[PDB]
Amino acid sequence: GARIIYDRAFLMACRGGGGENLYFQGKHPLQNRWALWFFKNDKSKTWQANLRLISKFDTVEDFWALYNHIQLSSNLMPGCDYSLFKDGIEPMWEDEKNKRGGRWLITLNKQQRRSDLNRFWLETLLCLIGESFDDYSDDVCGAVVNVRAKGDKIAIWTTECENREAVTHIGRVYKERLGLPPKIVIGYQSHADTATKSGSTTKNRFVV
Amino acid sequence: ARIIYDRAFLMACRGKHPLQNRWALWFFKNDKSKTWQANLRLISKFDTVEDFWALYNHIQLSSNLMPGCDYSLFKDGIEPMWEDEKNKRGGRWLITLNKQQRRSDLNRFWLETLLCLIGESFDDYSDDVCGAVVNVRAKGDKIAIWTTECENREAVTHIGRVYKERLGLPPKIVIGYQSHADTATKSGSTTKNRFVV
Numbered sequence: 001g002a003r004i005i006y007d008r009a010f011l012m013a014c015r016g017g018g019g020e021n022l023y024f025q026g027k028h029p030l031q032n033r034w035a036l037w038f039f040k041n042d043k044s045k046t047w048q049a050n051l052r053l054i055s056k057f058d059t060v061e062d063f064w065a066l067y068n069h070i071q072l073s074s075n076l077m078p079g080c081d082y083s084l085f086k087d088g089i090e091p092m093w094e095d096e097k098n099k100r101g102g103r104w105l106i107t108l109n110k111q112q113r114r115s116d117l118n119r120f121w122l123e124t125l126l127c128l129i130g131e132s133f134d135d136y137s138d139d140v141c142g143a144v145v146n147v148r149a150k151g152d153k154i155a156i157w158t159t160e161c162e163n164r165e166a167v168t169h170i171g172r173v174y175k176e177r178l179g180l181p182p183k184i185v186i187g188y189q190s191h192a193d194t195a196t197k198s199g200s201t202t203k204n205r206f207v208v
Numbered sequence: 209a210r211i212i213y214d215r216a217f218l219m220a221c222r223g224k225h226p227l228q229n230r231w232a233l234w235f236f237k238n239d240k241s242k243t244w245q246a247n248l249r250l251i252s253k254f255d256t257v258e259d260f261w262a263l264y265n266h267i268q269l270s271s272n273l274m275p276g277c278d279y280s281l282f283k284d285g286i287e288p289m290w291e292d293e294k295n296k297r298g299g300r301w302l303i304t305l306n307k308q309q310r311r312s313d314l315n316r317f318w319l320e321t322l323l324c325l326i327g328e329s330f331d332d333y334s335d336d337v338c339g340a341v342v343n344v345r346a347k348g349d350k351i352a353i354w355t356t357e358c359e360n361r362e363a364v365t366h367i368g369r370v371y372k373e374r375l376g377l378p379p380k381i382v383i384g385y386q387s388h389a390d391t392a393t394k395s396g397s398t399t400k401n402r403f404v405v
């Protein structure tokens with residue numbers, strides 16, 4: 001009665017349609033159901049009005065259908081954010097599953113939009129849907145991409161910043177899967193520190 | 209697979225269970241010194257049974273009934289205005305309540321409407337549902353389910369028959385479906401009903 005885990009190679013092989021899905025039993029179930037959110041930035045609107053749920057999915061094939069659809073139907077607008085979160089967790093730090101939590105953060109420079117945004121974001125998505133952090137995948141809430149003019153942010157959000165073992169294992173595996181050099185250190189920030197603006201930086205509770 | 213909750217399951221969850229859709233609760237007062245942008249205020253969004261009940265229990269305790277007001281629950285991304293792309297070709301099953309039935313049936317009928325929406329009570333035809341509107345008025349209240357396409361007769365009349373069943377209305381009491389394009393034009397004391405159940 002075990003966790004459903006997909007490595008990167010298996011998820012890539014399941015890409016590009018193909019499956020007949022006979023008996024509604026030929027699709028590959030995910031451990032969790034996931035919801036894709038969009039948060040727009042315009043028209044003098046409340047935080048709630050700008051957050052929109054796009055779509056939910058709980059198979060590898062339906063992930064790839066949505067991915068292929070967004071990849072062909074959507075263009076990149078700064079001010080926007082996309083978030084993939086487990087079903088029942090809103091992509092806001094005030095949520096019961098995020099308020100005690102935080103994020104592993106990747107910051108991309110202006111150059112790296114064109115070179116690394118799509119690659120790093122896909123690798124992040126596969127880490128989530130594939131349950132890549134072993135038992136510590138349960139600490140994962142979701143992932144956020146902030147598209148910005150200064151430079152783009154990609155983050156894995158986790159549920160509890162005081163779970164050092166879980167947080168640091170997520171961190172180490174994520175950095176490995178992004179193929180980041182050991183010189184490039186990524187930082188974990190409590191959402192409670194990120195919420196308070198106190199200077200040019202937020203404190204990192206952990207680094208890998 | 210579609211997430212469907214019957215009435216009994218949703219009531220059992222009242223003091224997390226995902227909804228098929230995310231829903232947005234809107235409030236609208238008729239005020240001309242402010243116009244349709246400032247009058248229409250978003251109150252809150254939700255996509256679980258428990259968060260529906262938290263908001264319901266909150267509004268039920270914290271809010272008192274003012275005529276001229278309207279509340280609307282619509283799917284996330286559909287504004288509660290007929291000009292919206294998802295409503296302009298559509299219409300509404302309308303329940304009109306007399307002055308007496310404000311005290312007896314408003315809260316009951318409105319709750320039953322809400323459960324039909326969040327529970328996906330119309331089978332595949334729940335996708336034709338946009339939302340629901342309650343207009344609190346002195347003449348007598350209005351409750352309506354809004355659907356996306358008035359030319360989908362099969363979708364529309366299934367919704368109306370299930371809705372009428374869930375309101376526990378007698379078969380003598382016939383409800384009417386009105387195109388938003390007919391309701392927009394004031395032509396007398398009544399609007400034409402494209403269908404009736």
Ligand SMILES: CC[C@@H](O[C@H](C)CO)c1ccc(-c2ccccc2F)cc1NCCO
Binds near residue numbers: 063070072083118125
């Ligand atoms: C920031 C990348 C953004 O780019 C779009 C093409 C618009 O610029 C984007 C957003 C969401 C998803 C997404 C799809 C399926 C499941 C979860 C998801 F988050 C994928 C992408 N991009 C893929 C590569 O283009």
Ligand SMILES: CC[C@@H](O[C@H](C)CO)c1ccc(-c2ccccc2F)cc1NCCO
Binds near residue numbers: 233267280
């Ligand atoms: C019956 C109209 C109004 O009644 C109050 C007395 C108004 O001050 C009302 C409005 C919205 C909601 C509502 C709550 C949660 C989600 C969607 C909703 F539309 C519930 C109610 N009434 C509850 C039962 O009386």
